[PDB]
Nucleic acid binder design. Structure first.
Ligand SMILES: Nc1ncnc2c1ncn2[C@H]1C[C@H](O)[C@@H](COP(=O)(O)O)O1
Ligand code: NA
Ligand code: NA
Length: 326
DNA sequence: CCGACGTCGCATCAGC
DNA sequence: GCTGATGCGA
DNA sequence: GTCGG
């Protein structure tokens, strides 16, 4: 209502720049421009007013002038009508098809899901699974579902080994009523840096979840990370729950809790905590915490074993995930 | 002017 | 066959 | 595209 019309404009140009022009840097720029505006409690009456905000320059200021004066963006309308560009942006929506594949497909005449089904012998394992759950992937995951899903993973991860620590991070940790992705992090005492690579640990857990029919498909799998699809048990009378995305990541006990807080969020929280860490003399790198020197030479990573453990370094108190928004 | 805007493990591909 | 670049996803 | 050395 306020600046929703402008934000929608910037977000469209953002996706265009990512999928069509393949300019991730201009994509992030347009995305950042829409962010600061979405936090502005006032109706932007002119581009000059918007340029004041960090992330908005002259180009975006001029665009707003046209959007308010004419009622839309002239350059944006040409993009929408352009069959070639509008189709490329669509194909990328499919998990597996990126900005490169989408273009290669359109050149061959493949532009829709219907056209994809015909030429399925041209899609790899990932691209096929994506097409299969095209809609199920674009749907949001309610907290209640996340809770039910969590119990299963926790029950199965402990049922296979009591020394397994698994915590679902992300928006879920912050108490979000939604999620859209099930990011799980796990560790074991038998895995601590110096310890040799463990292709048995992650594989062990994955097999157990597939054993109870939770994990349906697999996008990619290795010795440390896992990416696939999952689904809750079919309910009586009612229709079965949609297929959801799930990522499992094995992390050492030395980088576990340090890696937990990072994936716990938020995106703004990481920035504020990264800057404050440097103010005291420490530097965060997702994995460990290093005490830099007078010239900035990071030293030997100091021991970490908990969530508050890291706060007991930068003179900060334990801030609850429900408040780690900013 | 003009270069920096995170990352990185896994699957597919190129070249040798 | 092995090595190394490129594409993809959060 | 937007910022800052
Ligand atoms: N450019 C860049 N650098 C570093 N981290 C980034 C960047 N862009 C996004 N993110 C992080 C911020 C969130 O923790 C996560 C997305 O959360 P999700 O719930 O998966 O949408 O990705
Ligand atoms: Na600005
Ligand atoms: Na895609």
């Amino acid at each position: 209502t306020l600046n929703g019309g402008i934000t929608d404009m910037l977000t469209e140009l953002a996706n265009f720049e990512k999928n069509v022009s393949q300019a991730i840097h201009k994509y992030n720029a347009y995305r950042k421009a829409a962010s600061v505006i979405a936090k502005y409690p006032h109706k932007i009456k002119s581009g000059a007013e918007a340029k004041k905000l960090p992330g908005v320059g002259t180009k975006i200021a001029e665009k707003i002038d046209e959007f308010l004066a004419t009622g839309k963006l002239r350059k944006l309308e040409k993009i929408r009508q352009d069959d070639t560009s509008s189709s490329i942006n669509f194909l990328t929506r499919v998990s597996g098809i990126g900005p490169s594949a989408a273009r290669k497909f359109v050149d061959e005449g493949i532009k829709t899901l219907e056209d994809l089904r015909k030429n399925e012998d041209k899609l790899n394992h990932h691209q096929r699974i994506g097409l299969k759950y095209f809609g199920d992937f674009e749907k949001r995951i309610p907290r209640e579902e996340m809770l039910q899903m969590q119990d299963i993973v926790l029950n199965e991860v402990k049922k296979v080994d009591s020394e397994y620590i698994a915590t679902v991070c992300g928006s879920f940790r912050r108490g979000a009523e939604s999620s859209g992705d099930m990011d799980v992090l796990l560790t074991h005492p038998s895995f601590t840096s110096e310890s040799t690579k463990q292709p048995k640990l992650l594989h062990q857990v994955v097999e157990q979840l597939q054993k109870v029919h939770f994990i349906t498909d697999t996008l990619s799998k290795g010795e440390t990370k896992f990416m696939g699809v999952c689904q809750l048990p079919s309910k009586n009378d009612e229709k079965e729950y949609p297929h959801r995305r799930i990522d499992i990541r094995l992390i050492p006990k030395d980088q576990y809790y340090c890696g937990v807080l990072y994936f716990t969020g938020s995106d703004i929280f990481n920035k504020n905590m990264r800057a404050h860490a440097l103010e005291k003399g420490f530097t965060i790198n997702e994995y460990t915490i290093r005490p830099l020197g007078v010239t900035g030479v990071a030293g030997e990573p100091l021991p970490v074993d908990s969530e508050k453990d890291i706060f007991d370094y930068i003179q900060w108190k334990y801030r609850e995930p429900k408040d780690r928004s900013e």
